[PDB]
């Protein structure tokens with residue numbers, strides 16, 4: 001019982017975090033096999049091809065705990081630098097580089113000077129930002145999920161936008177969203193609420209004994225989506241209905257039955273009550289997140 | 296910028312988690328130096344002295360990943376069993392066993408069959424329960440804080456109470472609160488809101504640019520505490536005022552100035568607004584937690 005914002009255990013990623021310094025700029029890097037991945041900002045509308053051609057291997061100081069790693073090659077892939085080192089990281093886990101979709105969640109290992117400081121769970125927003133917690137020095141911190149023994153890296157941190165939300169890249173150095181790795185007037189666009197996740201969280205609440213918002217009514221997918229549009233919720237697809245199957249079967253509450261509760265909650269509010277300790281509808285838990293915690 | 300429920304990186308604790316089996320009962324244990332600590336329930340109003348005298352070392356199967364550890368001695372300390380093994384854990388961090396106070400926070404590494412599954416942040420409630428997320432098999436999961444390189448273990452998980460909240464012990468096997476490690480009708484008593492933490496979180500909100508709840512008024516400590524009593528908030532002490540000093544100085548908002556905002560929020564509610572993404576007043580962040588994230 002209970003339901004928490006829960007991150008993956010971070011140890012497999014902690015053993016990969018290093019410090020990268022070029023000039024007077026220091027940030028975090030990710031050491032997997034004999035390559036260190038970090039934001040290309042470490043070499044700073046400049047032309048990064050020009051900036052990198054002017055560097056050599058000895059300009060890069062890579063520190064793994066107390067050991068200095070010798071850089072033997074350098075190259076750029078999109079907004080990430082790849083520094084080849086002379087030593088494979090003996091702590092390299094099984095890993096993949098996997099780009100995530102808006103609405104999916106991941107764990108963030110916030111790091112400063114190559115030293116992990118904290119771990120928390122984030123969702124990729126529909127507008128391709130994350131609501132992270134990052135201070136100066138956090139560039140190069142990574143986001144990930146873990147399946148069995150395999151770390152799927154999905155995010156490297158680059159930027160804070162004017163509203164205080166965050167923007168970054170996949171591990172191929174391609175930005176999530178229409179953002180760049182320099183100071184411009186760029187700003188997050190309008191966001192929307194992740195409907196399938198709200199429904200998953202309502203199922204988590206039922207599994208944990210919160211039932212006050214349930215009702216006898218069912219709705220049609222079409223009539224639900226008309227209400228979703230009015231409150232800035234994403235339309236519900238049949239694929240989303242399908243992915244909620246397991247939770248619907250465990251609770252005995254049909255997906256379109258739960259949709260009628262959500263419609264009522266949007267129209268009427270909570271009337272001073274809470275669900276799973278929240279006074280708002282939470283949209284940062286996926287159906288998989290719920291199944292993992294509410295087994 | 297940003298403010299998240301943030302746990303400590305769990306790697307130092309992950310390297311200590313083992314599986315302990317006795318009979319048909321399996322749960323988690325904590326392997327530090329040559330001792331494994333686990334809930335004494337693994338040997339199951341019985342007399343545990345009698346139950347343990349009837350065991351021998353060979354009745355305990357301890358598995359660290361794929362390696363079986365040989366048990367060479369066994370003893371009980373309060374509600375924890377201590378199994379001496381023939382091998383010191385080479386991954387033992389610097390550590391301490393430290394009992395925490397109500398109102399303080401810690402990270403929980405939820406574990407099943409000796410395998411870490413997730414990490415989240417918890418506060419010890421005034422009524423000595425935690426609002427955890429634990430399923431069957433989680434007995435022996437631990438809570439901790441980390442300072443520099445040193446893990447301060449403060450919690451070992453034992454019980455789920457009828458309301459779905461959780462009860463456990465320090466690493467000396469002494470329960471937090473008036474609970475026992477067997478099935479009785481025991482229930483959590485009435486809880487209260489941790490006032491100093493709510494104030495710390497309001498400072499976190501100001502640091503992050505949420506200012507709508509501020510006002511020009513100040514109050515007296517006495518008049519504040521009269522309102523706290525009415526809404527089931529703990530009384531504010533001068534020691535708590537003192538610990539909020541650093542946050543008061545960073546924001547330029549006197550503690551008793553912030554108390555006048557909290558009084559207004561309790562009397563009037565939020566009027567459809569949010570603070571740091573919440574529609575309720577959050578009390579599970581200590582002043583230290585805020586300073587760590589809002590540096």
Ligand SMILES: *C(=O)c1ccc2ccccc2n1
Nearest residue numbers: 039041139140158181182183
């Ligand atoms: C960190 O990786 C990073 C990338 C880009 C950038 C631009 C401007 C200020 C700070 C930055 N940090």
Ligand SMILES: *C(=O)c1ccc2ccccc2n1
Nearest residue numbers: 334336434435453476477478
């Ligand atoms: C786990 O450590 C534990 C302790 C005590 C207990 C009593 C009854 C049921 C389950 C239990 N688990």
